[PDB]
Amino acid sequence: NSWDYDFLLSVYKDKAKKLEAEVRREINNEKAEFLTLLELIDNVQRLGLGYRFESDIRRALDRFVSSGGFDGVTKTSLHATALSFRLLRQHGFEVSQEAFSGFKDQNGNFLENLKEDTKAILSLYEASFLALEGENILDEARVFAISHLKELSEEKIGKELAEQVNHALELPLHRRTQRLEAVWSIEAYRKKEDANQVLLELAILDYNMIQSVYQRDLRETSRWWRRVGLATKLHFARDRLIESFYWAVGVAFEPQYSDCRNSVAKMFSFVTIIDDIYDVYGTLDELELFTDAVERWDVNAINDLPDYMKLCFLALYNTINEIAYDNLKDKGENILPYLTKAWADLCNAFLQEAKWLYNKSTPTFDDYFGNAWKSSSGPLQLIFAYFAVVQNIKKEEIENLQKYHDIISRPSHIFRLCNDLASASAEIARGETANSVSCYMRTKGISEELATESVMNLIDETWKKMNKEKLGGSLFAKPFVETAINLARQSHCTYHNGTSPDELTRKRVLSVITEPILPFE
Numbered sequence: 001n002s003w004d005y006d007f008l009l010s011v012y013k014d015k016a017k018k019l020e021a022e023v024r025r026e027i028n029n030e031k032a033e034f035l036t037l038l039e040l041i042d043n044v045q046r047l048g049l050g051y052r053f054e055s056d057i058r059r060a061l062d063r064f065v066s067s068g069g070f071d072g073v074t075k076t077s078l079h080a081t082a083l084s085f086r087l088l089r090q091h092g093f094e095v096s097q098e099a100f101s102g103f104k105d106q107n108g109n110f111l112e113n114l115k116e117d118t119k120a121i122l123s124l125y126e127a128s129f130l131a132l133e134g135e136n137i138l139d140e141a142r143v144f145a146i147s148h149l150k151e152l153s154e155e156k157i158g159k160e161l162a163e164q165v166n167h168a169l170e171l172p173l174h175r176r177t178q179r180l181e182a183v184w185s186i187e188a189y190r191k192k193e194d195a196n197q198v199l200l201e202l203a204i205l206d207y208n209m210i211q212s213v214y215q216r217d218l219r220e221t222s223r224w225w226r227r228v229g230l231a232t233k234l235h236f237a238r239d240r241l242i243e244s245f246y247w248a249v250g251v252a253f254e255p256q257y258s259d260c261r262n263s264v265a266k267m268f269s270f271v272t273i274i275d276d277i278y279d280v281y282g283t284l285d286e287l288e289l290f291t292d293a294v295e296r297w298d299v300n301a302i303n304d305l306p307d308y309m310k311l312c313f314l315a316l317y318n319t320i321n322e323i324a325y326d327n328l329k330d331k332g333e334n335i336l337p338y339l340t341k342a343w344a345d346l347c348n349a350f351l352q353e354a355k356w357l358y359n360k361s362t363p364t365f366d367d368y369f370g371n372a373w374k375s376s377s378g379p380l381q382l383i384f385a386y387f388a389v390v391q392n393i394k395k396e397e398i399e400n401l402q403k404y405h406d407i408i409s410r411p412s413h414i415f416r417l418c419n420d421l422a423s424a425s426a427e428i429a430r431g432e433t434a435n436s437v438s439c440y441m442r443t444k445g446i447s448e449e450l451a452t453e454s455v456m457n458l459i460d461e462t463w464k465k466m467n468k469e470k471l472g473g474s475l476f477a478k479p480f481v482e483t484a485i486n487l488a489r490q491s492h493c494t495y496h497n498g499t500s501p502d503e504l505t506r507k508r509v510l511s512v513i514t515e516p517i518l519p520f521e
């Protein structure tokens with residue numbers, strides 16, 4: 001495979017193989033107790049090894065379904081029901097929210113006594129986030145579960161169990177990124193006395209092994225950044241190359257995706273610079289020229305651009321033409337049209353923002369946001385990821401992406417929202433209206449708290465839609481759908497509060513890229 005301990009690794013190569021095999025045997029063990037089998041799969045996934053046993057995990061889930069599994073314990077234990085529900089759906093299996101109806105009273109509410117078992121509550125909570133539109137029971141399940149977890153103290157349950165709850169409350173499993181979940185779960189798993197030493201070692205090894213790939217990737221990308229040295233010449237621009245790669249890892253963590261990673265990290269870096277040129281540095285007349293230049297994509301015309309924009313455009317022009325050349329050489333297809341198109345759209349979105357600002361405009365939430373998620377660069381990032389993740393491009397798919405299909409628009413919605421939500425307070429208090437939350441206030445004539453709650457709910461409804469795209473009725477390949485969704489995941493993991501906001505970030509970036517995980521004891 002493209003991720004085996006032979007294609008990547010190479011004696012450690014031998015230690016990995018032995019451990020990996022042992023785990024496979026465990027997932028495939030047909031004499032295993034279903035509940036134990038599911039908790040195994042759960043650990044393997046949280047620990048970050050799920051991709052390596054993708055096939056095995058399905059095999060297991062299939063035998064579980066084909067035999068009905070514990071179709072009787074779906075009335076006996078909430079924990080099992082929730083875990084099985086979450087895992088089955090996670091893997092495309094069909095499951096009904098009615099599998100929980102047997103946990104509600106006459107009035108139609110989850111029994112109170114359930115709160116006693118803090119484990120089953122966490123499992124239900126986690127399962128609620130994989131809901132679709134219409135599944136009210138799951139919506140109620142989350143409201144019910146959070147009400148209990150909120151109160152839980154370290155004393156009531158214990159240091160270990162409490163960390164689990166605070167972790168879930170911070171960000172649900174379904175929404176956190178694979179790597180971020182991995183670093184946390186490993187540290188948490190290595191502390192357990194009953195921790196599987198074989199699995200623990202594989203997790204550690206595999207994590208550091210992949211992490212090395214990242215460093216090698218960020219290494220070449222940095223080579224590029226330096227030669228381009230766009231930040232050093234543009235005294236106003238900010239450098240965010242490392243921040244960009246970290247972002248990229250969220251979107252495409254699988255090692256085999258170095259391409260997609262470098263492609264997103266480069267794009268995000270450029271989005272950063274060009275973003276500033278539009279809302280802080282350039283004048284409308286200049287932005288107007290830049291926008292026009294991107295649309296024409298003519299190098300023999302970069303002379304109509306002011307010095308600094310000329311330097312910026314050329315760097316962009318080449319980087320893109322370079323990506324196009326790669327595809328041509330590897331796919332025998334000319335994808336330049338689509339790529340340059342994505343940029344024309346983003347710049348026009350950026351220009352729309354610049355104009356609204358200069359003209360003191362106050363567009364309705366609907367209009368502002370409709371432009372905001374496009375100016376987030378999310379859809380552009382995905383369009384680029386598409387060509388880097390799928391080996392066989394289909395005319396039909398690219399056309400849909402070009403028209404901003406829900407597969408990339410939806411996750412972009414969240415991206416923009418999580419962002420504006422972070423800057424909401426500051427920008428609002430600073431008298432600014434250039435913020436989704438602010439528009440929602442003015443448009444609905446409501447307080448900040450109310451506006452914020454609505455943004456949150458809007459996000460929840462978006463997730464439900466995304467979950468449907470992933471479950472079924474999709475034109476795109478599941479892989480890309482998960483990549484698209486990853487952008488939403490990364491947005492949730494990137495815009496937070498914390499310790500210090502800037503502190504939790506520095507830590508994560510170091511835990512995800514720089515520093516490896518402490519060796520196995």
Ligand SMILES: CC(C)=CCSP(=O)(O)OP(=O)(O)O
Pocket residue numbers: 271272275279353375376377419
């Ligand atoms: C566009 C991105 C992803 C980052 C720069 S921060 P921002 O979203 O406030 O910038 P704009 O609203 O596009 O001017």
Ligand SMILES: [Mg+2]
Pocket residue numbers: 275276278279350353375
């Ligand atoms: Mg901007």
Ligand SMILES: [Mg+2]
Pocket residue numbers: 275276279
């Ligand atoms: Mg900005």
Ligand SMILES: [Mg+2]
Pocket residue numbers: 420423434435
């Ligand atoms: Mg903003």
